[PDB]
RNA sequence: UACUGUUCCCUGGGAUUGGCUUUGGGCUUUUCCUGCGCAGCUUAGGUGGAAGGCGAAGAAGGCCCCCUUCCGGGGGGGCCCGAGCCAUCAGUGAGAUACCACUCUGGAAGAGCUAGAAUUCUAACCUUGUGUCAGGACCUACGGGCCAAGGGACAUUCUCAGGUAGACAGUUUCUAUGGGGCGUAGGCCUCCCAAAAGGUAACGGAGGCGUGCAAAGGUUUCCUCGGGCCGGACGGAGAUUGGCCCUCGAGUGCAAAGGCAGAAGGGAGCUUGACUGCAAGACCCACCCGUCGAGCAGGGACGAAAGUCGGCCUUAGUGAU
RNA sequence: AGUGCCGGAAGGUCAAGGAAGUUGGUGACCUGAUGACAGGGGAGCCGGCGACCGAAGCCCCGGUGAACGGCGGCCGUACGGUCCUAAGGUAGCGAAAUUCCUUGUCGGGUAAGUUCCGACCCGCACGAAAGGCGUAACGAUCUGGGCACUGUC
RNA sequence: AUCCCGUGUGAAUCAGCAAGGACCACCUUGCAAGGCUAAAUACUCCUGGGUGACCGAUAGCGAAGUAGUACCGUGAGGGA
RNA sequence: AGACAACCUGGCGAACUGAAACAUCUUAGUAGCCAGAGGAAAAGAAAGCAAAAGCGAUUCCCGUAGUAGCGGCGAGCGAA
């Protein structure tokens, strides 16, 4: 069956690749939970 | 699969339905040799829904 | 290597569970080509809006390269050139991608759509430290915090799915029987034993069945087989043809018993009663089951008619819930 | 060869799980003739059927016997003919803790030995790590014979 | 069907949601995912009061006597 | 905090047996163990019944009824 995870990520840090310090782009929850929101580099809408 | 019972329906009272006195295909199941008489049977017989004496067509 | 399962283990889907990147998968639209049995100017699949498109919205022919190539000859970038080329017409089962409507074959660029990858990354996850960090004091004592080192979204763990160990579990594994075992048999039909109603046992004596036939059924008409003897080409003890003589010893799909003469045996014509609705009444019996059926009702079959026909000359060809 | 184990392309077979599509139910809403219900049937909502993708395993392919196991007939004159099989027992040993027939036969041992020793081979049905055959020693081991010794007799 | 659960998904809010034995339509009924609550009901190691077509020392509790004693058993335990 | 005859709530959970064998099924969610608490405990104030007629939280007895049912449609089980 499978389901893709789509989250509503607002940024804070510049981010090496995709960031603006103000994107509204979407990613999987594995980015927010494991990488960013521990470090405090982003937030949820 | 050498001598087999077979399904003699009617060509008279082909499948109809509505109006209380319902038509309901008559049928006769009886045996022929498959090897001897390779073309299908086509006997004439009584059919109690036709009230006549119809041709009873073979099928499967 | 009994049946059914359980576990160990392996394998996939899903959760834990993230990220870029290139290479060549499937499917969806734009647009563009492509697609030579034979007629033969035609490297044309089927079909179609129906006769001017197009050209000076910078043309015929050509220079050299590019795409395709069953090598027949398509298609095309730029331009010296400079504004023509041409549709029915004749060959075909079809007409010209002159304009353009709709789609099969097989393919070229972009866009979407996902999926399959290999690698690495690291931040989840796993693992290491006589590395460090201390309460009133130790941790070269389990562990805890902190930097770190190595793996790395695999692995572990949960669920779902398919496999795979008598490793482990619950069971099952017939009866007859001249003691059991070894064998043989287990249901149905015929004959004997069976004692002249029926019935009747034994691991008593003999055989068959688990079907066949659209005609070997139904009816209408016609026919008399079998074995000898004598004559006759091949032909003989025996094929065919004639006569004679006992006559039913023949045949009757298949074991036996009982039956069957102008027949139930052998041939021909026409057909489908191998039919629906039933059924007084009997036979057979522990029950379950089985068997015969006059006759009536309808609608036919065959015959001139009277009549005969709801399968087979009869008894085996079969299973309840 | 069979089984086991180990390794191995493509092909077949192949679950859960998706997945393009088919087909049904219900029904706003149009409709149809005398008989009392009947045709459809948009959206939504329900249920079925599934072209394709889908691993291990198994078939399939190779290797392995101090892996489970197995190691032949028939007919003629040491020698040949012929059949089957994956292959037909090599060395050794052999009447044995294996031998049925059986007290096999031959020799030794005894006046006399179905037990004993050595040889033969007709191994019913030994046999190479469920090892084969030998072997000094050792045995409250089995099994024969002698001396000494005695109430075992 | 209704009620509850592991795994994965994952709504709506009275123009709603759920039930009325799959399921859809129309009716009717109710408001899930927060709690609390006496009675009638079950029983007897036990206390008081009553009763017995109950027992009378091989009966009645095992036990009418200082009985779970004597005794047996490593022990659980058995048991006059 | 531990103890406490039965009754009770929750957790785990047999087999002999019956089916004339036996695995579905039955024995049974019974016996047992474990945890918990009261005089009772649990239940309990409708996302409930029922049928176009109505009822109004539980719990217990009579009844419906051995009926509707379920069931190798067998043994049996059995409601509202």
XYZ file of C-alpha atoms (C1' of nucleotides) in Angstrom:
739
model
C 0.000 0.000 0.000
C 2.708 2.571 1.101
C 2.345 6.312 1.996
C 4.806 9.196 1.362
C 5.330 11.577 4.303
C 4.870 15.280 3.367
C 5.688 17.915 6.042
C 5.303 21.708 6.081
C 8.886 22.820 6.819
C 9.718 26.518 7.463
C 13.485 27.238 7.719
C 15.865 29.202 9.962
C 19.533 28.477 9.040
C 20.776 29.087 5.455
C 21.059 25.269 4.760
C 23.941 23.945 2.526
C 21.670 23.023 -0.415
C 17.992 24.021 -0.640
C 17.447 26.789 1.943
C 16.617 30.505 1.972
C 16.217 31.288 5.697
C 12.576 31.411 4.545
C 11.390 28.536 2.323
C 7.937 26.919 2.491
C 9.133 23.734 0.681
C 8.089 20.258 1.817
C 10.108 17.150 2.791
C 9.809 13.834 4.712
C 9.615 13.756 8.514
C 13.066 12.105 8.661
C 14.648 15.525 7.937
C 12.852 17.442 10.674
C 12.940 14.694 13.332
C 16.514 13.309 12.986
C 18.551 16.183 11.469
C 17.082 19.695 11.747
C 14.727 20.090 14.763
C 17.340 18.560 17.112
C 19.868 21.185 15.912
C 17.167 23.922 15.844
C 17.501 24.705 12.124
C 13.761 24.812 11.231
C 10.120 24.658 12.509
C 6.693 23.095 11.655
C 3.661 25.008 10.262
C -14.762 -38.962 -21.275
C -15.900 -41.631 -23.794
C -19.691 -42.080 -23.416
C -21.263 -39.000 -21.791
C -24.535 -37.631 -20.430
C -25.409 -34.431 -22.330
C -27.630 -31.332 -22.030
C -30.617 -31.305 -24.459
C -32.246 -27.881 -23.902
C -35.102 -26.536 -26.031
C -34.953 -24.308 -29.067
C -38.669 -23.916 -28.128
C -38.870 -21.886 -24.918
C -35.603 -20.044 -25.417
C -34.969 -18.017 -22.285
C -37.813 -15.564 -21.497
C -39.113 -14.342 -18.093
C -41.846 -11.828 -17.208
C -45.699 -12.253 -16.875
C -46.463 -14.675 -13.941
C -46.823 -17.870 -16.017
C -43.050 -17.821 -16.359
C -41.504 -19.499 -19.366
C -38.613 -21.407 -17.823
C -36.624 -23.455 -20.351
C -37.352 -27.183 -20.314
C -34.414 -29.609 -20.392
C -33.460 -33.252 -20.892
C -30.183 -34.818 -19.764
C -29.341 -38.110 -21.446
C -26.418 -40.127 -22.872
C -24.626 -40.340 -26.259
C -21.266 -41.759 -27.281
C -18.890 -38.881 -28.020
C -16.834 -40.955 -30.494
C -19.755 -42.535 -32.431
C -22.026 -39.577 -33.114
C -19.567 -36.634 -33.225
C -22.062 -34.010 -34.472
C -24.437 -32.770 -31.737
C -27.852 -34.408 -31.141
C -31.041 -32.673 -32.320
C -33.984 -34.790 -31.115
C -37.642 -33.750 -31.159
C -39.444 -34.114 -27.797
C -42.264 -32.817 -25.569
C -41.745 -29.535 -23.645
C -44.359 -28.837 -20.928
C -43.859 -25.025 -21.122
C -44.374 -24.879 -24.890
C -47.299 -27.384 -24.573
C -46.277 -28.608 -28.048
C -43.591 -31.109 -29.101
C -40.531 -29.037 -29.922
C -36.960 -29.581 -31.181
C -34.560 -30.040 -28.262
C -31.241 -28.456 -29.248
C -27.945 -29.759 -27.867
C -25.420 -27.511 -26.080
C -22.211 -28.385 -24.132
C 9.526 -40.131 2.959
C 1.902 -41.381 8.607
C -1.766 -36.806 9.265
C -1.915 -32.229 11.312
C 0.587 -28.405 13.583
C 4.417 -25.721 16.719
C 9.368 -23.860 17.099
C 14.663 -22.709 15.081
C 16.072 -20.559 10.609
C 15.669 -18.065 5.513
C 12.963 -14.732 2.254
C 9.637 -10.574 0.592
C 5.611 -6.187 1.890
C 4.943 -2.637 5.677
C 6.931 0.589 10.541
C 11.613 2.134 12.634
C 13.585 5.038 8.009
C 16.756 10.193 6.054
C 19.615 12.988 1.917
C 21.535 14.105 -2.655
C 23.476 12.719 -7.197
C 24.182 9.566 -12.786
C 22.117 5.660 -16.048
C 18.060 3.303 -18.931
C 13.069 1.096 -16.978
C 7.563 1.398 -17.635
C 3.289 4.711 -18.622
C 0.834 9.715 -19.970
C 0.513 14.501 -23.549
C 3.207 17.854 -27.162
C 5.446 17.345 -31.901
C 8.100 14.535 -35.711
C 9.195 10.848 -38.553
C 8.596 5.978 -39.890
C 6.809 1.861 -41.993
C 10.257 -1.236 -50.301
C 5.254 -9.928 -51.625
C 2.973 -7.958 -56.893
C 1.199 -3.027 -60.433
C 5.987 -0.130 -60.637
C 7.835 7.831 -61.758
C 5.707 5.355 -55.583
C 11.955 2.597 -48.834
C 2.504 3.342 -49.843
C -0.832 0.520 -42.625
C -6.243 1.276 -42.551
C -9.285 5.189 -43.681
C -11.006 10.254 -44.653
C -12.715 16.659 -44.527
C -13.067 16.506 -50.640
C -10.489 19.355 -55.401
C -6.663 24.078 -54.883
C -2.838 24.198 -51.670
C 1.570 26.742 -51.695
C 4.573 30.500 -53.565
C 7.825 36.909 -53.280
C 4.885 34.671 -44.333
C 12.477 35.677 -50.033
C 11.095 29.971 -54.863
C 12.794 25.287 -59.094
C 17.483 22.782 -59.712
C 21.968 22.186 -56.751
C 26.978 22.668 -52.998
C 28.627 19.774 -48.852
C 27.351 17.589 -44.291
C 23.609 15.543 -41.087
C 19.052 11.655 -39.786
C 17.364 6.913 -41.774
C 18.961 2.569 -44.704
C 15.218 -4.532 -45.862
C 21.267 0.032 -49.651
C 15.526 0.851 -53.157
C 16.385 5.778 -52.757
C 13.581 8.715 -48.598
C 14.143 13.119 -45.498
C 16.637 17.648 -44.282
C 20.533 22.326 -41.550
C 22.357 26.821 -44.176
C 22.791 29.328 -48.915
C 25.194 30.740 -54.383
C 20.464 30.598 -57.051
C 15.838 33.769 -57.297
C 9.620 33.354 -56.749
C 8.030 28.399 -58.862
C 6.124 23.787 -57.907
C 1.838 21.373 -59.632
C -4.355 17.427 -57.583
C -7.648 14.199 -60.532
C -4.863 12.154 -65.723
C -2.236 6.087 -67.105
C -0.553 1.560 -64.036
C -3.405 -0.694 -58.254
C -7.226 -4.803 -54.056
C -6.232 1.754 -52.097
C -4.955 7.128 -53.547
C -1.356 10.898 -53.799
C 2.118 13.309 -46.059
C -1.027 19.789 -52.548
C -4.328 21.416 -47.417
C -6.434 18.410 -43.421
C -9.941 14.731 -39.852
C -8.885 10.062 -37.079
C -5.724 6.062 -35.684
C -2.333 0.877 -36.202
C 2.959 -0.210 -36.693
C 7.912 1.512 -34.893
C 10.570 5.016 -33.329
C 13.432 10.940 -32.222
C 13.578 15.946 -28.553
C 11.149 18.090 -24.512
C 7.466 17.900 -20.027
C 5.062 15.126 -16.378
C 4.479 10.506 -13.769
C 6.422 7.100 -10.754
C 9.671 2.880 -10.021
C 14.785 0.051 -10.280
C 19.532 0.898 -9.204
C 25.159 1.545 -7.505
C 27.913 4.576 -4.675
C 28.706 7.904 -0.927
C 26.952 11.071 2.892
C 25.114 11.274 8.200
C 21.590 12.942 11.488
C 18.045 7.977 13.041
C 19.611 3.053 14.361
C 23.870 -0.610 16.010
C 28.855 -1.322 18.313
C 33.515 0.401 20.913
C 37.212 2.869 24.541
C 43.763 0.895 31.167
C 39.493 8.624 26.295
C 37.844 11.829 29.772
C 33.820 13.720 33.634
C 32.592 13.741 39.051
C 28.808 13.113 45.502
C 32.468 13.627 51.672
C 35.381 9.154 48.175
C 35.933 5.053 44.042
C 34.009 3.372 38.114
C 41.054 -0.533 35.247
C 33.578 -2.350 39.344
C 28.254 -2.712 36.241
C 26.186 1.418 34.515
C 25.308 7.343 33.726
C 26.864 12.370 31.128
C 30.398 14.415 27.565
C 33.705 14.609 23.323
C 35.039 10.895 20.308
C 36.112 5.929 16.825
C 33.953 2.205 13.500
C 29.570 0.593 10.946
C 25.397 2.806 8.585
C 19.362 3.592 6.778
C 21.529 -1.859 5.947
C 21.441 -4.458 10.350
C 18.427 -5.164 14.965
C 13.291 -5.011 16.878
C 7.328 -5.281 15.816
C 3.514 -6.904 12.369
C 1.936 -9.393 7.829
C 3.162 -12.991 4.022
C 5.840 -17.719 1.560
C 9.255 -21.400 2.495
C 12.149 -24.647 5.840
C 14.483 -29.670 10.612
C 10.456 -35.718 14.495
C 13.991 -30.208 17.193
C 9.129 -30.193 19.754
C 3.525 -31.519 20.229
C -1.362 -33.911 19.708
C -3.124 -38.180 17.409
C -4.097 -41.883 13.871
C -2.428 -46.660 12.101
C -9.921 -51.500 10.114
C -12.522 -56.145 10.644
C -13.118 -61.377 9.203
C -9.823 -65.417 10.874
C -11.216 -72.975 12.570
C -5.297 -68.864 18.654
C -2.708 -64.445 16.393
C 0.592 -63.080 12.413
C 1.841 -64.179 7.135
C -1.715 -64.597 2.824
C -6.720 -64.355 1.099
C -11.289 -61.727 1.190
C -14.824 -57.087 2.233
C -20.097 -53.990 -2.779
C -23.361 -56.126 -6.679
C -25.353 -60.472 -10.755
C -25.839 -65.995 -12.336
C -25.447 -71.304 -11.223
C -24.773 -75.286 -7.565
C -24.485 -76.690 -2.403
C -30.289 -75.734 -0.681
C -33.136 -81.093 1.272
C -39.016 -80.334 -5.855
C -43.005 -72.855 -1.923
C -39.758 -68.985 -0.449
C -35.521 -68.736 2.704
C -30.731 -70.747 4.226
C -24.323 -71.012 6.638
C -18.759 -72.447 5.851
C -11.588 -69.179 4.526
C -17.732 -74.857 0.403
C -17.620 -75.656 -5.568
C -18.044 -72.724 -10.306
C -18.124 -67.978 -13.192
C -19.220 -62.689 -14.100
C -20.158 -56.760 -13.106
C -18.369 -51.309 -11.821
C -21.182 -51.379 -19.227
C -22.652 -50.977 -24.217
C -26.274 -49.090 -28.265
C -28.800 -42.384 -31.655
C -29.264 -47.594 -32.834
C -28.354 -53.229 -30.786
C -34.497 -47.872 -29.107
C -40.072 -47.052 -31.025
C -43.274 -48.664 -34.403
C -44.751 -50.622 -39.908
C -43.699 -54.615 -43.269
C -40.663 -58.773 -44.735
C -37.195 -63.180 -43.769
C -35.902 -68.412 -41.218
C -31.237 -70.284 -38.833
C -27.066 -73.694 -37.736
C -24.536 -78.643 -39.066
C -23.881 -82.239 -42.605
C -24.428 -85.053 -47.773
C -24.175 -84.607 -53.231
C -22.716 -81.347 -57.974
C -19.987 -77.219 -59.369
C -13.452 -72.904 -62.102
C -9.238 -71.360 -59.000
C -11.288 -73.872 -53.764
C -8.820 -77.522 -49.852
C -11.802 -80.245 -43.905
C -13.965 -74.584 -44.691
C -15.355 -68.319 -48.640
C -19.104 -68.116 -52.973
C -23.844 -70.952 -55.989
C -27.521 -74.927 -56.423
C -30.184 -79.071 -54.686
C -31.160 -82.722 -50.550
C -31.674 -84.253 -45.178
C -32.557 -83.802 -39.383
C -35.384 -79.694 -38.246
C -34.199 -75.018 -33.778
C -28.564 -78.571 -31.682
C -28.001 -71.118 -34.323
C -28.303 -66.584 -32.726
C -29.750 -63.386 -28.751
C -23.154 -56.678 -27.889
C -20.766 -58.904 -22.510
C -21.018 -64.552 -17.144
C -24.568 -67.764 -16.260
C -29.697 -69.423 -15.651
C -34.510 -68.896 -17.381
C -36.611 -67.659 -22.173
C -37.537 -66.610 -27.533
C -40.748 -69.266 -34.227
C -42.846 -67.375 -39.137
C -40.381 -65.314 -32.941
C -37.544 -61.717 -28.138
C -33.478 -64.480 -33.662
C -31.986 -61.854 -39.227
C -33.172 -57.702 -42.958
C -35.603 -53.201 -44.753
C -39.179 -48.130 -44.485
C -40.405 -44.070 -41.284
C -38.845 -41.881 -36.776
C -37.538 -40.440 -31.210
C -42.753 -42.886 -25.908
C -34.626 -42.960 -24.126
C -42.148 -37.589 -23.034
C -44.788 -34.170 -19.136
C -48.586 -34.580 -15.334
C -49.838 -38.851 -12.452
C -51.613 -43.537 -10.605
C -56.166 -48.294 -8.309
C -53.320 -52.122 -6.966
C -49.675 -55.730 -5.688
C -44.400 -58.155 -4.716
C -39.881 -57.700 -1.448
C -38.747 -56.899 3.256
C -35.759 -55.088 10.817
C -35.143 -50.181 9.055
C -33.005 -47.559 4.905
C -33.693 -49.148 -0.175
C -35.692 -52.076 -4.516
C -39.562 -54.072 -8.050
C -44.102 -54.847 -11.381
C -48.154 -51.731 -12.754
C -54.119 -51.846 -15.270
C -55.829 -46.972 -16.135
C -56.665 -41.515 -16.693
C -54.837 -36.400 -18.576
C -52.254 -33.843 -22.195
C -49.326 -33.647 -26.512
C -46.953 -36.783 -30.346
C -44.687 -41.498 -33.122
C -45.755 -45.583 -36.509
C -50.141 -47.993 -39.397
C -55.308 -48.469 -43.996
C -57.201 -49.779 -39.415
C -57.574 -52.572 -34.724
C -53.763 -51.104 -31.973
C -48.524 -50.904 -30.067
C -44.594 -47.030 -27.731
C -43.224 -43.445 -20.717
C -35.753 -47.234 -23.457
C -33.295 -52.103 -24.409
C -35.724 -60.704 -24.048
C -35.315 -60.778 -18.492
C -31.974 -60.916 -14.041
C -25.468 -57.166 -12.882
C -23.450 -51.814 -15.052
C -23.664 -49.274 -8.423
C -23.901 -45.600 -3.212
C -27.368 -42.855 1.725
C -26.643 -38.095 4.551
C 22.448 -42.601 -10.595
C 18.906 -41.926 -5.665
C 19.234 -39.032 -0.903
C 22.161 -35.451 1.910
C 25.301 -31.430 1.811
C 27.911 -27.319 -0.817
C 27.999 -23.888 -4.816
C 25.386 -21.743 -9.694
C 23.550 -18.097 -15.042
C 18.948 -17.770 -18.098
C 14.008 -20.188 -18.216
C 9.660 -22.204 -15.732
C 6.825 -22.319 -11.166
C 5.771 -18.508 -7.416
C 2.741 -15.339 -1.495
C 1.536 -11.275 0.840
C 1.281 -6.558 -1.379
C 0.203 -3.052 -5.074
C -1.839 -2.106 -9.796
C -4.448 -0.329 -16.052
C -8.981 -1.811 -16.556
C -13.896 -4.812 -16.531
C -18.825 -6.051 -14.108
C -22.684 -5.656 -10.264
C -25.699 -3.065 -6.230
C -28.040 1.328 -4.761
C -30.028 5.983 -6.798
C -31.569 11.974 -8.204
C -33.792 12.079 -13.032
C -36.379 10.754 -17.886
C -39.629 6.847 -19.474
C -43.828 2.106 -20.251
C -48.359 -1.074 -21.007
C -52.424 -3.009 -18.604
C -52.217 -4.629 -13.782
C -50.458 -3.392 -9.716
C -44.593 -2.909 -10.778
C -40.878 -2.183 -14.758
C -36.990 -0.063 -18.327
C -33.032 2.479 -17.542
C -30.024 5.172 -14.697
C -25.698 11.169 -13.682
C -22.848 12.141 -9.196
C -21.595 9.975 -4.613
C -21.191 5.440 -1.725
C -20.618 0.259 -1.598
C -18.901 -4.889 -2.947
C -16.702 -8.472 -6.454
C -13.328 -10.063 -11.055
C -7.879 -8.573 -12.142
C -3.391 -7.399 -18.100
C 1.377 -6.129 -15.644
C 5.266 -5.900 -11.671
C 6.562 -9.766 -7.111
C 11.648 -12.720 -3.221
C 13.267 -17.021 -1.077
C 12.202 -22.029 -2.016
C 11.409 -25.967 -5.738
C 12.347 -27.935 -10.842
C 16.914 -26.946 -13.676
C 23.055 -26.846 -13.814
C 27.936 -28.246 -11.578
C 30.829 -30.425 -7.409
C 31.302 -33.762 -3.331
C 31.872 -40.889 -0.629
C 37.311 -41.028 6.759
C 28.768 -37.488 3.403
C 23.566 -41.345 4.026
C 24.505 -45.277 1.103
C 25.591 -49.205 -2.803
C 29.607 -52.600 -4.779
C 25.566 -57.851 -10.927
C 23.189 -61.665 -14.229
C 23.045 -65.569 -18.201
C 25.831 -68.928 -21.772
C 30.036 -71.398 -24.000
C 35.870 -73.320 -24.049
C 42.579 -69.554 -16.920
C 39.703 -67.743 -21.926
C 35.674 -65.576 -24.626
C 30.230 -64.329 -26.024
C 25.972 -61.466 -24.498
C 22.676 -58.506 -21.321
C 21.603 -54.911 -17.494
C 23.550 -51.094 -14.056
C 25.456 -45.111 -11.032
C 29.116 -49.015 -10.475
C 29.566 -54.139 -10.413
C 34.111 -55.683 -4.621
C 40.689 -53.976 -5.377
C 44.058 -55.291 -1.234
C 43.384 -58.379 2.607
C 40.925 -62.152 5.260
C 37.530 -66.584 5.006
C 33.318 -72.601 7.461
C 34.905 -66.996 11.421
C 31.404 -63.728 17.910
C 29.501 -64.048 10.505
C 28.488 -71.022 7.884
C 21.713 -72.178 7.145
C 22.822 -77.147 4.594
C 26.698 -78.950 8.865
C 29.443 -83.015 13.421
C 31.641 -79.551 5.509
C 36.300 -82.155 3.901
C 41.399 -82.791 4.778
C 45.709 -82.942 8.388
C 47.321 -82.155 14.003
C 46.184 -83.079 19.017
C 43.485 -87.982 22.262
C 42.551 -95.454 23.162
C 38.146 -92.722 21.379
C 37.354 -85.247 20.249
C 29.359 -82.340 17.389
C 34.417 -78.329 21.444
C 39.966 -77.027 19.977
C 44.476 -75.877 16.300
C 46.272 -75.422 10.799
C 44.673 -75.790 5.604
C 41.024 -75.853 1.706
C 36.919 -71.989 -0.405
C 30.595 -74.592 -2.425
C 31.924 -66.325 1.446
C 23.183 -69.134 2.281
C 24.559 -63.619 3.901
C 33.333 -60.925 5.305
C 35.587 -56.519 3.317
C 38.657 -51.610 3.858
C 37.617 -45.547 9.024
C 29.136 -48.559 11.393
C 37.570 -49.227 9.017
C 40.629 -54.112 6.614
C 44.421 -57.190 8.197
C 48.314 -58.008 11.613
C 50.549 -57.103 16.682
C 54.876 -57.323 22.026
C 52.397 -56.289 26.402
C 48.003 -56.231 29.729
C 42.602 -59.267 31.201
C 38.433 -61.425 38.750
C 37.892 -61.606 29.568
C 36.136 -65.969 26.462
C 37.838 -70.715 24.615
C 41.044 -75.672 23.930
C 45.435 -78.693 25.831
C 49.389 -80.207 29.523
C 52.231 -80.652 34.446
C 51.662 -80.519 39.729
C 47.622 -81.377 43.108
C 43.837 -83.495 45.559
C 37.129 -86.914 48.542
C 35.403 -83.634 42.337
C 34.665 -89.098 41.404
C -23.864 -6.900 11.659
C -22.962 -5.090 16.840
C -18.284 -4.864 20.924
C -12.831 -5.031 21.651
C -7.739 -5.548 20.099
C -1.543 -5.992 17.370
C 0.068 -4.060 12.635
C -0.439 -0.091 8.981
C -3.403 3.886 7.390
C -6.499 7.788 8.881
C -12.096 11.280 8.743
C -16.306 14.593 9.997
C -18.549 18.007 13.764
C -24.748 18.645 14.526
C -26.304 21.268 5.884
C -22.624 16.525 11.460
C -21.664 11.680 13.377
C -23.261 6.426 14.799
C -27.083 2.510 15.119
C -31.436 -0.021 13.314
C -27.775 -8.270 11.759
C -23.573 -7.308 4.662
C -24.639 -3.334 1.642
C -27.177 1.500 -0.714
C -31.487 4.800 -0.476
C -35.453 6.881 2.631
C -37.367 7.017 7.586
C -36.767 6.354 13.140
C -33.548 6.292 17.403
C -29.516 8.064 19.860
C -25.292 11.155 20.875
C -18.955 7.242 21.286
C -13.580 8.312 21.853
C -13.570 12.252 30.582
C -15.304 10.555 35.218
C -18.813 9.220 39.959
C -23.093 6.712 42.002
C -27.272 3.689 47.126
C -30.829 -0.484 46.495
C -32.761 -5.039 45.082
C -28.086 -9.646 44.155
C -23.872 -13.396 45.675
C -21.611 -16.022 50.304
C -20.378 -18.171 55.837
C -13.787 -18.598 59.331
C -17.936 -16.033 62.216
C -22.010 -13.491 66.558
C -26.958 -13.462 68.633
C -32.060 -15.534 68.425
C -35.088 -19.525 66.745
C -36.215 -24.512 64.274
C -35.376 -30.101 62.948
C -40.408 -37.250 60.215
C -31.059 -34.515 61.574
C -26.559 -37.752 64.080
C -25.923 -40.351 68.923
C -19.580 -42.579 69.807
C -17.758 -47.999 63.135
C -22.756 -42.115 63.378
C -22.100 -36.677 63.663
C -16.780 -32.050 61.927
C -10.820 -35.710 60.970
C -11.448 -34.330 66.018
C -17.597 -35.715 72.752
C -10.368 -37.339 76.313
C -5.024 -31.072 76.972
C -6.393 -33.461 67.880
C -4.497 -31.653 63.192
C -2.442 -34.453 68.826
C 0.358 -39.516 68.802
C 2.734 -41.491 64.762
C 5.010 -41.547 59.708
C 7.727 -38.562 56.016
C 14.481 -34.955 54.116
C 10.264 -32.215 52.353
C 5.660 -30.596 50.399
C 2.356 -33.721 52.857
C -0.439 -37.726 55.222
C -2.960 -38.882 59.731
C -5.362 -42.286 63.882
C 3.335 -2.439 53.566
C 1.114 -7.902 56.160
C -3.093 -11.123 57.448
C -8.236 -12.623 56.061
C -13.457 -18.988 55.480
C -16.390 -18.219 51.201
C -18.434 -14.586 47.831
C -16.281 -10.871 44.027
C -12.922 -7.878 40.178
C -8.726 -8.196 36.924
C -4.170 -11.227 34.737
C -2.513 -16.086 33.000
C -4.950 -20.538 31.804
C -4.956 -26.752 31.563
C -6.124 -31.951 30.708
C -8.728 -36.282 31.628
C -13.575 -36.432 29.640
C -17.957 -36.208 25.505
C -18.073 -36.798 20.254
C -19.028 -44.488 21.441
C -11.781 -43.511 17.632
C -10.098 -38.234 16.601
C -7.656 -33.149 14.965
C -12.810 -28.784 14.126
C -15.789 -28.849 18.309
C -16.795 -30.259 23.823
C -14.803 -30.406 28.663
C -14.239 -24.179 29.741
C -12.872 -19.523 29.907
C -14.000 -24.469 34.328
C -9.953 -26.288 37.836
C -5.561 -24.296 39.164
C -1.933 -20.352 40.081
C -1.136 -14.826 40.333
C -2.639 -9.837 41.710
C -6.586 -6.652 43.984
C -10.630 -4.813 47.263
C -15.457 -4.531 49.816
C -19.140 -5.646 52.923
C -20.866 -6.947 49.022
C -18.067 -6.544 44.232
C -19.020 -5.436 39.431
C -22.243 -3.128 36.418
C -24.854 1.857 35.531
C -27.459 6.981 33.653
C -28.403 5.539 26.180
C -23.708 7.253 20.017
C -29.580 2.061 23.962
C -34.228 -0.980 22.698
C -38.146 -1.247 19.059
C -41.128 -0.629 14.722
C -44.299 3.193 12.418
C -47.195 1.516 17.891
C -44.157 2.742 21.508
C -40.124 2.392 25.877
C -36.979 5.442 28.968
C -29.698 4.029 33.755
C -28.440 -0.269 35.835
C -28.826 -5.359 38.650
C -31.801 -9.782 40.280
C -36.322 -13.582 39.954
C -40.679 -15.578 36.795
C -41.238 -15.948 31.657
C -40.766 -16.051 26.567
C -38.031 -21.460 25.429
C -35.410 -25.481 25.189
C -38.539 -21.319 20.626
C -35.310 -18.074 17.039
C -30.917 -19.809 15.865
C -25.398 -21.810 15.636
C -23.153 -26.743 14.883
C -17.234 -32.182 11.347
C -25.781 -28.985 10.616
C -22.158 -34.362 14.366
C -21.614 -34.508 19.709
C -23.612 -30.742 21.397
C -24.299 -25.055 22.300
C -28.595 -21.907 22.676
C -30.499 -16.054 22.748
C -33.192 -11.510 23.009
